[PDB]
Structures are given as C-alpha cells and as structure tokens.
C-alpha cells in the first residue's frame, strides 16, 4: 500500500491556518521523491533530514498538517519564528524533525472580488505552544470591561479574514502549506 498523500496535497478545499487540518499517516509505505521531484512547489526545504535521504528512513507515525496562508509568511513556518501565524495560528517546536511544503494556489483559492473564507487568528492572549490548535471565537478582551460576547470598542473578534485576489501581488496570493512531522510502521 501507498500512503495517501494524494488527498493531502490535492484536496479540493484546505482548512484555515487557525484551524489547521491534521491527518495521521500510519501503516503504509511512503514515497517522498514523488513529492520532491514534482516541482509544483515553490517552497520545499527540510529540517532534520535531507529530502533525498528521507525516502530510506522509517518512523512510527507521520503527521500531515495542511492549511492556507498568504504567500508572504511561508517564512514563518519554520523552527523559531515569530509573527501572527507563528504565534497565534501554528507554532513549530525548535527541535523540529519533519518538513514543510508550500505551493501557490492563486488559481484555486483566490476568486475575483475576494475569497474571504480563509481566516487567521489575529488577537490571542499568549503565544501558542508547538502543535497547538485554537478554535475559540470568544470575543477578545482588548480592554478592561465585560464584553459579554458582543463586540464594540476594545471587544474584537479574534479572527481576521484573509483577502485573496487574482490581481494582487505574488506574496499576497494564497499559498497552500503542508507541514510534515516525523516521530516503526511508516517506512519507505
């Protein structure tokens, strides 16, 4: 059997970066040079193990972590990065074994007038722990007042929505990102 990378890297609808999708890859044979040699990815650099030599290595389980970010902050999907996405949406530990695939999806995830489905967490009380998922749409407390679930001054919805256009810049275009993690069932 082959590991099901096909609906990880070619799903018709990814998830937002605050609600980053996670799939567990277990009990299968994985080919990684089919991922490596495709050249449809603008970003594929690997930390902890070289991409050519990780086809020959085995792990117990592998997490495939998929979301959609703007193309400027694919830099933030790295060990030891700071920003909105690296602190309030998706944090990688410093001892990261695993690697990150990012490719452009302007032709799919961006529509004329604005594909506003993708959101990111803008306000959060503290930095995320590595591989931590937050969903909670409680009204953020910018001030010192009982907001009581209704917005207004100093009571903000914590989820800013991405604005994606087919006319804007390359770094402002939606980049689908798949993050692979490594931990003996999943070999090459």
């Amino acid at each position, epitope marked *: 059997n082959l590991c099901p990378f096909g609906e990880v890297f070619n799903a018709t609808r990814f998830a937002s970066v605050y609600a980053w999708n996670r799939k567990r890859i277990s009990n299968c044979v994985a080919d990684y040079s089919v991922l490596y040699n495709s050249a449809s990815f603008s970003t594929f650099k690997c930390y902890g193990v070289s991409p050519t030599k990780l086809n020959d290595l085995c792990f117990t389980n592998v997490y495939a972590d998929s979301f959609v970010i703007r193309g400027d902050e694919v830099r933030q999907i790295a060990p030891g990065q*700071t*920003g909105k996405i690296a*602190d309030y949406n998706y944090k990688l530990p410093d001892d990261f074994t695993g690697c990150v695939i990012a490719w452009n999806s302007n032709n799919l995830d961006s529509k004329v007038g604005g594909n506003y489905n993708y959101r990111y967490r803008l306000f*959060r*009380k503290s930095n995320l722990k590595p591989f931590e998922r937050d969903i909670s749409t409680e009204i953020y407390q*910018a*001030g*010192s007042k009982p907001c009581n679930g209704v917005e207004g001054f100093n009571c903000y919805f914590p989820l800013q929505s991405y604005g994606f256009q087919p006319t804007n810049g390359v770094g*402002y275009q939606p980049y689908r990102v798949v993050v692979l993690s490594f931990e003996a069932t999943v070999c090459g």
Partner: antibody
Amino acid sequence: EVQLVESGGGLIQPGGSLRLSCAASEFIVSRNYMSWVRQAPGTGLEWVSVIYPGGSTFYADSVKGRFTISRDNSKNTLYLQMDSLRVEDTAVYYCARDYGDFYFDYWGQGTLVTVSS
Amino acid sequence: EIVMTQSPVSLSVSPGERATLSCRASQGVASNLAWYQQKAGQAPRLLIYGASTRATGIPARFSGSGSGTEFTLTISTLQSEDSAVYYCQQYNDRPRTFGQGTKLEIKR
C-alpha cells in the same frame, strides 16, 4: 476614559540611554498590539517598533539592535529601552495602540527626545 | 519598502469646496492603506482604515477611497477645524511606512 500618557522623554547625551514610558488606561498594554512611532521634523512620521499581545518585538531597520520595546505587566506601562542614541533620533515619540499589526488606532500625546551636545 | 507620495503637497481650499487628497504607492497595497489627521500640536488622529472605513467619531464628511496603488481622501464640507496635515500609511509590508503628509489649509 481612553488615555496614553507618555513620559521619560527629554534631553539625553548622544551615546546615552533612555527609558521611555506609556501609562495606558482602559486597555491593558500586555494584551494589545502596542507600538512606538516617532515624528521627526524635516523627515516624515516614521514607525519605530511594535510589540504583540504577550508576543514578540519587531523593529525598524534604522533602530534595530539599539532600541528595545519592553512592556511591564504589573501596571499598564509600555516602555522603550533606547540605547546608543544618535543625533538622527531627535523626534517626538508616540506610543500608539494598534488594531492588529495594522494601524495606529489611538495615539498618545507624544514625548519629545533631543539628542545633542 | 513602499514609498508613499502625497501629490498635492500643500492645498489651500475655500471653506467648502470638497477638497480631495491623494497618495500613490511604490508597490501594490490591496485595500491596505490608512489615513491620519495631525492637527497643530496634537497626535495624528486616525481617519480611515482599510482605505474606506471611517473608524469612530469620524463623520461622513471624510470619504476616502481607492485601491491597489492609487488612493484618494475626500474632505467634504471643510470647516475651519479641518486645517491639519493628512498622512497615509500602508499595511501590507513591514515596515508600515507613512507618506509625507498633505498640509491642508482653509481660506478666509
């Protein structure tokens, strides 16, 4: 009652140190995107620094390494550790609460810093 | 970084003519441009965020528009209190860079 009272600005030596302040009210510094903006005469109004909720510190390329934003969480007091000052830092320094890391929604009255001999 | 150029660098308008202020960009900022109003001896109060949204206490007289790389601020009725310096910044790339500001003055 929304205030941002700034203190600590004044004459300091060029090659000195400053420890500015911004005493907030009605919003907590520790959980808001706070930022420092300087207005120098002759040049434009220029962004200096920003701090995220809990978060992290980001600086401009003209101030990177020599400046340091460091809030306090016992009272709402945003600081700006301002070390190795040069004479191109003669500017009115504003603390400014941001919405996101987007726009300076509310501003303090500003405090002026003169660095000369 | 993005260099904003407020083109009417000083504009003297009679009290009520629907003055119009503009700033262009060195790059593309989608709707990502703010406007600020700095009166004499005051902090620059925010006027319009996202190039089209009057924030809080900002009346309907201020009518900023434009997107991409060409931007407009429209001051409608021009009381004496509108004599200030009007800035614009971008959101899209770090650092957030202001314009040179438009000094608008009223005529008596």
